[PDB]
Design a protein around this ligand. Structure first.
Ligand SMILES: [Zn+2]
Ligand SMILES: [Zn+2]
Ligand SMILES: [Zn+2]
Lengths: 245, 11, 247, 247, 13, 12
């Protein structure tokens, strides 16, 4: 039996908007500590990992760990039917489908969506803890607009962490552009870094934006970037991007 | 070059 | 001489706005008692009826019943040229082949004059008996609207059902099934017999473009008979939609 | 070199939105007294004239007169990467191969540098002989944009008429016909003798894209010569559009 | 389908 | 249509 009642339904709405565009199907691992999801996009250039802790939920119970394979396009479709102040409970039987119950925030009206669950052949992948050479924490809106702006200019962004602060650069037919950010923005450097990334993926990641007014970027020499959005102390959405080569 | 396979393995 | 002045002109925009989606052309029956219009959608599954009582206009004058055939798309396009805070006045001559609409801005500095061409409609007035309904549901119009937009994403048909002092709409499709249980709360349910029908969601979603007209909608239903979806207008009349059950 | 730093970067964003719709390419005439641009549209039926005086920038340096050939489509794509609050600097070396647009957040925490390839543009500046006008009309820009947008659902030409205290805009088409009458009181009319001219509305709707730069707009008309449509920019210039009567 | 409404609302000679 | 403005505004 799984049952998880979340008061701020908006959270789940937005989490599902963020996933559905990067990926299409993904296995939600439900266990006693909370809800865990970790998948790559079709090309394997990007991964996302979602964590939602049990303490985030007004109620939460899980009897046997489980691993639900879900169409994320479909789930997000069902969720478009929850209002932004609705109270959403998910619910699944021991060993078939997923209830979603949406409760009117206060005035009573309840909705009951049932969706199937597809058999999915996913394998768990290991993220080897690492200390990053450069960590940037900036307002999430600002990062979204930078990826949006530079994507008008060229399809790649060169991200440069130096003493000063941090610079983003791109170029194409229109010309060249770069944007420099200095030190609410905090930079936490350790050995300057320069990397290049595909703006396409970054513009998918910034879809998590409504979840948080801040984002943190993590880089080291020749390793995948981490974009992270904290979800009001109940967890997060982490995205990883391999370096454009 | 491109994918995350080189940085993340099964297990 | 037909002349009718409506101070709250927005009402007339929202009205055209609501008709136009369901039907392209209809005949406006004008008489001393006011404005009556009626038409089935082009595939005869549904029907819309509007009444705007002469009481409801600030000025009304009808010298002789008339019946104007109106291209509802054209008229809606002309009405968009009215400000939402304009005084709207309608006006028609002898047997004339046109309708003048006049839009006056509150201030008193801008007056817009439009002459819409009319058309020949050879339509047959349909008879609509009033009857007592098993379940009658008064609810907020936005809820109704959202319920229908929601179930639309799940399938083409909604099963409307009333049980013990409570209503429920359900639907299913590729993605799975779902239902939405409203309870008597402002939701008022008048039941004298439990009732259970299926309707085309596509039509209900046309019906709900009349939402801006009223905070309130009433659904009326009985076994085997058209669903009536009503939006009372201000203190002026109503706009009713009727919909055949799915066989 | 040329260096100009505009505190309200929103003015440039707006100027550029209102130019690129009318014209794809233009020469920006930089002198020490400010920025002058002028161009007919491709069909040579109308012309834009933009003026931005040096006093209106908090910093302004022009060491030698300059003529930059700018793809305004591309400049506007770039101006979109500027906030509305951003301070915008423009900078070119007197050999004009590139134009730099630097966008600075007020808090200075973020600075964006963009480099645009400039263009080879042979253009014969045009003479706008001195003109005095029978009828000048000052009226809210947004009111005038509504008049144009609306009449343009009715027809593709507008007759504009001054005759007494007011002015009338008329159009007519398939749906029927329509006219809009404006009287005085913030609408003003300095009418010296009546005048009546016909114009293509398609162009006026281009002009009205400048609407966000100002909350008033001025129209100037005399018998048989181009309408002048003018939007003032801050205290620091204007965007004048001109349009040739219907033959 | 069509005309399922005709059966309920007929044209009133 | 075209060039109707060419008659009021000529190269200088
Ligand atoms: Zn009534
Ligand atoms: Zn029929
Ligand atoms: Zn020409």
């Amino acid at each position: 039996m799984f049952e998880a009642r979340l008061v701020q339904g908006s959270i789940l709405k937005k989490v599902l908007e963020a996933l559905k565009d990067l990926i299409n199907e993904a296995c939600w691992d439900i266990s006693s500590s909370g809800v865990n999801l970790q998948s790559m996009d079709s090309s394997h250039v990007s991964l996302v990992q979602l964590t939602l802790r049990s303490e985030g939920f007004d109620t939460y119970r899980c009897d046997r760990n489980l691993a639900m394979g879900v169409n994320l396009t479909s789930m997000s479709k069902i969720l478009k039917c929850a209002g932004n102040e609705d109270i959403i409970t998910l619910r699944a039987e021991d060993n078939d489908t997923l209830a979603l119950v949406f409760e009117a925030p206060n005035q009573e009206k309840v909705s009951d969506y049932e969706m199937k669950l597809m058999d999915l052949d996913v394998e768990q992948l290991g993220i080897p803890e690492q200390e990053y050479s450069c960590v940037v924490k900036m307002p999430s809106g600002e990062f979204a607009r930078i990826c949006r702006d530079l994507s008008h200019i060229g399809d790649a962004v060169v991200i440069s962490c130096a003493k000063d602060g941090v610079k983003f650069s791109a170029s194409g037919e229109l010309g060249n552009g770069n944007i420099k950010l200095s030190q609410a923005v905090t930079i936490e450097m350790n050995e300057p870094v320069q990397l290049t990334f595909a703006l396409r993926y970054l513009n998918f990641f910034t879809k998590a934006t409504p979840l948080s007014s801040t984002v943190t970027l993590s880089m080291s020499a020749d390793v995948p970037l981490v974009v992270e959005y904290k979800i009001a102390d109940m967890g997060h959405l982490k995205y990883y991007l391999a370096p454009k080569i | 070059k491109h994918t995350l396979d080189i940085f993340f393995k099964p297990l």
